[PDB]
Amino acid sequence: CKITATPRQFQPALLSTSKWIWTGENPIPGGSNIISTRPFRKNITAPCGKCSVCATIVVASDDAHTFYVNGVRIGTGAGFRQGQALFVALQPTWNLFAIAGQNLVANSPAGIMASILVHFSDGTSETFVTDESWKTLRAAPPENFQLPSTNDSNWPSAAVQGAYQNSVWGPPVLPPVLPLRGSNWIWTSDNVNGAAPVGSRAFRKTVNQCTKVAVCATVLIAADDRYTLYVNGATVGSGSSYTVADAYTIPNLHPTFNTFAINATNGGGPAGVIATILITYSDGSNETVVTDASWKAIQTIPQGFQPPLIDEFGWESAKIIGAFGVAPWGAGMVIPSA
């Protein structure tokens, strides 16, 4: 169904309403459990009138986990001290989450905790969490436990080992929404010897995976001194800090061809813009695009620098000022939580 949602400020999945769950082989919530691998399933149905588009996921585990969405493996992680961020495109009405958790220390606690923030076509969103509504088994995961087509109608409920505020684990640290390590500060080639002239500069990067279906994009960005961000010609947002980064979700990507454009301005001295972009596809894979030398850049901004299709003849390759961590900006950027 029709997608009304427009680019907006990124909205985090939070763990404070989720519960730790496990099988209940030991009925003491948070008691000791054996080394084992156990399966967990959760079905979700769109409310009448709207279609689910994509999801933001934070997951932590004692001890480890493997995360599937509609049968596609989307991540593996471990540890209860820090959560792990995942992004996945969804089907319009029915969606299946499946986690294979592992207890790797004998006679130790066990549990998985996840928060799934589901975004709908009209712009609203709903948080689903780990709780007793997840199915589980008191045995190792059968073949294809993660496929929607496996029948779990008779599986028992998962057993809650503890709420977010409990006496066993404590609040897991939320990861950054997206990493900047691996992205680069870029600018036009008039940035030389640590400084750049005063004024504005434009940057383009197009993503065109013609055999896949693009769905959602998450964007983390910062610039010295300020920026405005456009996707397919539409304004997403603006910022003016090179010490506090901004994050946006773009829920209306064109399905095959999308162009991100930046208009960054230098107020004086050093200049630079840095961004990490993650696009989710309908097949369950995703793509990370960073600011680097493949971005196109220009010093005199033509009118219509932000439309998707333009003649990129007079544009240069963006110059890399430095990988994230370079001076003066350093490694201390404040990054929104996933």
Ligand X SMILES: OC[C@H]1O[C@H](OC[C@H]2O[C@H](O)[C@H](O)[C@@H](O)[C@@H]2O)[C@H](O)[C@@H](O)[C@H]1O
Assign residue 249 a region: left if phi > 0, alpha if psi is -120 to 50, beta otherwise? beta
47 binds ligand X (CB under 6 A): no
Nearest to 181 by CA among 293, 335, 14: 335
- Based on CB atoms, which residue is closest to Ca ion, 63 or 152? 63
Pick the piece of the chain touching ligand X (CB under 6 A) from 115-123, 261-269, 292-300, 307-315: 261-269
- Based on CB atoms, which residue is closest to its own copies, 215 or 264? 215
Task: Give the phi and the psi of residue 260 in degrees, each rounded to 5.
Answer: -100, 135
Round to whole Å and give the CA distance between 295 and 299: 13
- Based on CB atoms, which residue is closest to Ca ion, 221 or 271? 271
**Which one of residues 267, 302, 307, 325 is an interface residue with ligand X (CB under 6 A)?**
267
- 330 interface partner picked from Ca ion, its own copies, ligand X, none, CB below 5 to 8 A per type: none
> Binding residue per annotation — 268?
yes
Nearest to 321 by CA among 302, 297, 337: 297
> Binding residue per annotation — 246?
no
Round to whole Å and give the CA distance between 263 and 214: 24
Residue count (the chain): 338
Rule CB under 5 A: which of 201-240 touch Ca ion?
Answer: 224-225
> Binding residue per annotation — 292?
no
The amino acid occupying position 229 is L
- 302 interface partner picked from ligand X, its own copies, Ca ion, none, CB below 5 to 8 A per type: none
Query: Cβ of residue 280: shortest distance to ligand X, in angstroms?
Result: 34
Query: Cβ of residue 297: shortest distance to ligand X, in angstroms?
Result: 18
Beta-sheet pairing, 52-69 with 286-290: unpaired
Q: Is the dihedral of CA 221, 248, 231, 301 positive or negative?
A: negative
**Which one of residues 35, 105, 244, 334 is an interface residue with Ca ion (CB under 5 A)?**
105
Query: Cβ of residue 111: shortest distance to Ca ion, in angstroms?
Result: 8
Pick the piece of the chain touching ligand X (CB under 6 A) from 62-70, 120-128, 268-276, 316-324: 268-276
- Based on CB atoms, which residue is closest to Ca ion, 135 or 226? 226
> Binding residue per annotation — 336?
no
Specify the residue for token string 């980064």. 245
Round to whole Å and give the CA distance between 143 and 33: 23
Footprint of ligand X on this chain (CB under 6 A)?
Answer: 224-225, 267-270, 328
